[PDB]
Amino acid sequence: EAMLAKVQASWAQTAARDKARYADERVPEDVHWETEYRYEQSADPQQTLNLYYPAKRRNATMPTVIDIHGGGWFYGDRNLNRNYCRYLASQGYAVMGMGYRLLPDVDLRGQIQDIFASLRWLSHFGPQRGFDLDHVLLTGDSAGGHLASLVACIQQSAELQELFGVSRVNFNFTLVALVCPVAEPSKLPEAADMSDMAAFYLDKLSGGDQALVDHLNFSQVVKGLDLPPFMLIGGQNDSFYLQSQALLKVFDANHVTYTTKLWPASAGPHLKHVFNVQHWEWPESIETNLEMLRTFDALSKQQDQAEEN
Template sequence: MRFEHGEMEALVMADDDILTKIQAGWAQTAARDKARYADERVPEDVHWETEYRYENSADPQQTLNLYYPAKRRNATLPTVIDVHGGGWFYGDRNLNRNYCRYLASQGYAVMGMGYRLLPDVDVRGQIQDIFASLRWLSHFGPQRGFDLDHVLLTGDSAGGHLASLVACIQQSEELQELFGVDRVNFNFTLVALVCPVAEPGKLPEAAGDMSDMAAFYLDKLSGGDAALADHLNFSQVAKDLKLPPFMLIGGQNDSFYLQSQALLEVFAADKVTYTTKLWPASAGPHLKHVFNVQHWEWPESIETNLAMLRQFDVLSNQRDEAEADDEDDL
């Protein structure tokens, strides 16, 4: 398709208007998050270390936090890796800090990274940042108490999308080449997706501003790269891969519940092993998008997050038992 000069100018102006609207919306979200954190109870008995740089860069987004229980009984603890949400345009390593603190308080070593955001990079750049943080953890995690034989990867909303891609890329040399990364030297015991937007190509089918501007989001995610545009959805990258078990967390009052329904269809079609923790609409209108991350202290959030950790424990124990059986057979 060819555009005359005036038509191209109009398109650029339209994109600028959309970007301004998106950034204004996320600025409002940031203000709400700031107010929420001011009122929110901070999980107790947690030690945290902040602003480790996982790249040789001054970019504040390319940093990560570590969280541990204040009183450790073991030299190493099972690992939880959290990928924050924020519509690919918003957030940093601190966005989910109280959620990460809560998970650590339950006896886990937790890492939460930042990553560069749209429109400064496309999804390839975001995936490269996440893999860089995983490489950092593979090098420095064990000496800091991270047991990388037992790893839970989790992400919420857009972070759920990125976590789902990471799980697939880890299992595919073809995807590693497309996204410009190398697999890391540990595996994921469980991948838990919280209200994930793992099928961004289906955003036009939903409601709200993000759906109204879906074409803009998709263009920024792909960066205009046709090959990347064909590998944005979990359904596009998961085919024929041997994936770890997944857990889908959410509920019918999630504004993006259509995304959860779509993901369940993909799980079934691709024979992905999965469990769910999905709250019915009758459980209450307060159980909205990523409620268990934003409000870790709610009873429903505690139930949800403990269910995720217990599923991780079960799979970790099964793995250990299988390895012990293999050793007995030698």
């Protein structure tokens, strides 16, 4: 299929831009990482994760951040968001970022299983190496944000656990921060031709499974669940700003607690797609990322106080 090759041509371009940016960009200081952990009994190189820490740990355990990278469900691996993970870690957090098998090798169910496996690995092995799993920030960008939004709902729902073939992990999400998410992929074709291409993504995500078709969008998996708070991050110059707008409507209709950090057009044309993940060193990226971490900390302090701890 030349639809497949065309999609893959587009991600190869992205790959060369990401590679060029990384070669140039300043790297965050004062961070250690531990790389390439297999999170299941499998040689698939996508079923691996990296862990990141401040080089100097002021406690034996630190609050946890778990990152799900983006790339349109067809692209990326555990190293794509390394500078962003390093940055957050440098702020005093233990950070996990996982790979997941890519479309079309898998469908959505396979990707959700990978992320849950990574989470379960972390529940078994994280705390002995510095992860405090009582305070956990789940975050993801673009397709990563889609995936994080679904993971948050699945973790709360016995029904969805069964449908997706995973079990609950033995920890909760203190906050779920979505960075320019595409939380409503069914809305892609109608929105900003290319519709043929957008139907192709949708088919590869569903794998023809009608249960996945009916559970691909955050609006489908949100219903009836009491969820952690969400934080929605992005800006008017995000090419999928339409998705962010739509998601607010859904949050509002479902009584989801959320906060925002949405950059206005007047803040500039540089504040594009996932700018705060791709360019950690920019002043606006520092502001955004620290505001997310502070929100996370404010929630974690409230939790400690409620729990008489």
